Amino acid sequence: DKKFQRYLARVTDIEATDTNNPNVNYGIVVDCGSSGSRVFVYCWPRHNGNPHDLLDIRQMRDKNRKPVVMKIKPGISEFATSPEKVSDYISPLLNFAAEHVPRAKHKETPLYILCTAGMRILPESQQKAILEDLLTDIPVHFDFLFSDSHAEVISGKQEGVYAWIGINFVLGRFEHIEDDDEAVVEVNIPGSESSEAIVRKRTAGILDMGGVSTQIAYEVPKTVSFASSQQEEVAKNLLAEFNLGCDVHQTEHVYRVYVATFLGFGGNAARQRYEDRIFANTIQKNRLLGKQTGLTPDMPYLDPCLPLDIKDEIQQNGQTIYLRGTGDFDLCRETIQPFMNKTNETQTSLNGVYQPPIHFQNSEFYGFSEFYYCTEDVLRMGGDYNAAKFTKAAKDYCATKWSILRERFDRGLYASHADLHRLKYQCFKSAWMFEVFHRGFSFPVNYKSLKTALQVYDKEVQWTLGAILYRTRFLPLRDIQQEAFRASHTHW
Numbered sequence: 001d002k003k004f005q006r007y008l009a010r011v012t013d014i015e016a017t018d019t020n021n022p023n024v025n026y027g028i029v030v031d032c033g034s035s036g037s038r039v040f041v042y043c044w045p046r047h048n049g050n051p052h053d054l055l056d057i058r059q060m061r062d063k064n065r066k067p068v069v070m071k072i073k074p075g076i077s078e079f080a081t082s083p084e085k086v087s088d089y090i091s092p093l094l095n096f097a098a099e100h101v102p103r104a105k106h107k108e109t110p111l112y113i114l115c116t117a118g119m120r121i122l123p124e125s126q127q128k129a130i131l132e133d134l135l136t137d138i139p140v141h142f143d144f145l146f147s148d149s150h151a152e153v154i155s156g157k158q159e160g161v162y163a164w165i166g167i168n169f170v171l172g173r174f175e176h177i178e179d180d181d182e183a184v185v186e187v188n189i190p191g192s193e194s195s196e197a198i199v200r201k202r203t204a205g206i207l208d209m210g211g212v213s214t215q216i217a218y219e220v221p222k223t224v225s226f227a228s229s230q231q232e233e234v235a236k237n238l239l240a241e242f243n244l245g246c247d248v249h250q251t252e253h254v255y256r257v258y259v260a261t262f263l264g265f266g267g268n269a270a271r272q273r274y275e276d277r278i279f280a281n282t283i284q285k286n287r288l289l290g291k292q293t294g295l296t297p298d299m300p301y302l303d304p305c306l307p308l309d310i311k312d313e314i315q316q317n318g319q320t321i322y323l324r325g326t327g328d329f330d331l332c333r334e335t336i337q338p339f340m341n342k343t344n345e346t347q348t349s350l351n352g353v354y355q356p357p358i359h360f361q362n363s364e365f366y367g368f369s370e371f372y373y374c375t376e377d378v379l380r381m382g383g384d385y386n387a388a389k390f391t392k393a394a395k396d397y398c399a400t401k402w403s404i405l406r407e408r409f410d411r412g413l414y415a416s417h418a419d420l421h422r423l424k425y426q427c428f429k430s431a432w433m434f435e436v437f438h439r440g441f442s443f444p445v446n447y448k449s450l451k452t453a454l455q456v457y458d459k460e461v462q463w464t465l466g467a468i469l470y471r472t473r474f475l476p477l478r479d480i481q482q483e484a485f486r487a488s489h490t491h492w
């Protein structure tokens with residue numbers, strides 16, 4: 001009903017942004033990643049004066065009814081030693097934005113340049129060099145609102161928060177009241193009595209398993225009781241407390257969000273760590289004294305995490321170890337358990353990192369990247385996750401002879417996104433996905449509220465959307481509280 005209407009509205013309301021309307025305002029965000037940089041132009045109409053409503057921010061739409069986006073390579077981090085050269089590298093992006101945003105609105109349009117992993121690993125001295133060249137150079141060539149705070153290297157925690165804001169915004173979870181169809185939660189605002197709890201729309205957490213890293217972000221509605229003051233020190237760094245509303249004295253839009261990123265716990269990284277131990281363990285006595293030493297193709301290591309009868313090899317330090325897949329999904333899950341790096345500490349997930357309790361019976365999550373590729377690309381069951389249906393299909397895929405899988409791949413049976421790498425490593429990654437989810441993060445096997453997906457309302461999740469939404473959160477104060485800040489004239 002209201003979900004279908006919102007679903008239908010976002011897909012069909014793509015009419016080009018009316019640049020001739022003086023009541024539209026604009027904002028610009030640059031995502032400075034490692035592989036490159038992208039710019040997004042967002043617009044919104046005048047705020048309706050309701051303190052409970054956020055801005056109606058949307059991607060700008062050109063005359064062709066396309067999102068106003070441009071991308072360039074290879075990224076800003078490459079100029080670690082050429083900071084003076086950086087302002088010309090982002091010039092194609094700002095000229096692109098200046099074209100679409102009306103000249104009259106440039107002075108009132110903010111520009112935000114937020115850099116992620118590419119700049120995080122540079123020496124701090126060189127990070128500051130790049131920001132300063134942008135800060136001193138851009139204001140002369142463009143009229144956008146650009147200050148020291150507008151150019152920044154954001155942390156991975158901030159990136160997770162912004163992405164969490166982005167998805168919940170498009171899903172309408174910050175629209176309050178009219179939650180008649182949607183689910184609601186009881187919230188304890190940080191630093192407030194237990195009887196001051198409020199009731200508002202439940203939010204959706206995000207699970208993202210990339211090639212290298214796995215990320216998890218969700219809201220912690222209820223007060224958390226920590227076991228140790230030290231545990232709280234760790235949790236401090238994994239918890240974000242912010243206010244999305246314009247009134248700092250209201251609490252309706254105050255959220256506590258947990259964000260954790262696990263380097264080396266992505267699908268591909270896990271497979272590499274697994275192969276590393278197979279390679280290292282060649283000189284273990286059990287491997288040497290058996291017939292799975294792996295030193296020649298006639299005595300290969302039998303890998304249950306590979307499709308049945310596939311022949312693979314590990315090359316490292318000039319040596320070579322030969323493998324043969326036995327396609328045992330359940331045995332693969334047991335083998336890769338150690339690589340989650342779980343400890344015996346309570347309230348911890350991967351790598352012994354603290355995790356706030358999840359109200360599983362009253363929660364929902366979206367699964368991105370491998371969570372979707374491992375359910376859809378070959379198993380063809382993306383969307384609502386069901387452990388029983390997934391484990392069965394995953395088991396059957398792994399037990400299928402490599403030649404049969406290979407023959408089906410050539411006939412086009414699988415998703416057009418699936419390549420031979422997907423066909424080969426689906427088994428390991430499906431089992432890794434299953435274990436990270438159900439024993440890494442401890443989601444119940446019967447969990448019914450996970451939806452794997454590639455996009456939401458037929459559009460990619462823009463963490464830049466959560467960034468613009470957070471940075472512009474006070475603009476509604478103009479339309480609303482003009483009186484509160486009226487100048488007081490003195491009669492001397």
Ligand SMILES: *[C@@H]1O[C@H](CO)[C@@H](O[C@@H]2O[C@H](CO)[C@@H](O)[C@H](O)[C@H]2NC(C)=O)[C@H](O)[C@H]1NC(C)=O
Nearest residue numbers: 262263264265266269273338339340341342351
């Ligand atoms: C998983 O845990 C293992 C240890 O249980 C980590 O391996 C250690 O990494 C440190 C680097 O900080 C080395 O100094 C140790 O020698 C390693 N020990 C062993 C036995 O290899 C490993 O880095 C962890 N994995 C991830 C992805 O964090």
